[PDB]
Amino acid sequence: DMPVERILEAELAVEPDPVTNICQAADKQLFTLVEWAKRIPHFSELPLDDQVILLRAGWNELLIASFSHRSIAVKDGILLATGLHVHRNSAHSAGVGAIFDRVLTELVSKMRDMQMDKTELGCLRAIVLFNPDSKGLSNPAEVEALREKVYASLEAYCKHKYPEQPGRFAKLLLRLPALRSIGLKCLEHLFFFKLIGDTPIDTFLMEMLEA
């Protein structure tokens, strides 16, 4: 069983140099991300080594999805978990305007246009979490079965909450490629900051960038 009501609870029980502030907010969220996964149904029933693999595989996409949806209220900006606004001009003046525009156009604004609610967001994050392709999983089909139940519950919720939008379920799933693409780009930036060393990187975010 994978009820969307408990997936929504995981979201809300967790909802609170510009590059420097962004990285500090990322480290803050890695701590609350772990508490979010434990609240996802059946995640803690997975083997501990599998929970480590899934969180190391998805943390970047998971956090990008959160601050993007959180920023539906902001215009030409992104609301960080620390309460700080990063406007579009501040990000461009910092040399990250390109990836910043991608988040704004492919995620935030796409989330705002369709009015993606917090239940749908939580299910997409759960789908990202239960990634059966993550290398090293002891039981991939166990994680795949969890993913299928999440999007089964999501499609049921979409036919229930928005019965006049027959294509809304697929529209949600088809934001995941762009999320995967933006996640890989954000990772490249983070490694580049760690290689050059001119950007402070806290402990947990540093641990996610190691082997």
Binding site: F31, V34, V52, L55, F204, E207
Partner: peptide, 10 residues
């Protein structure tokens, strides 16, 4: 993976 192991064990 010191930090991630500790936070998952609770």
């Amino acid at each position: 993976h010191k930090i991630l192991h500790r936070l998952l064990q609770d």
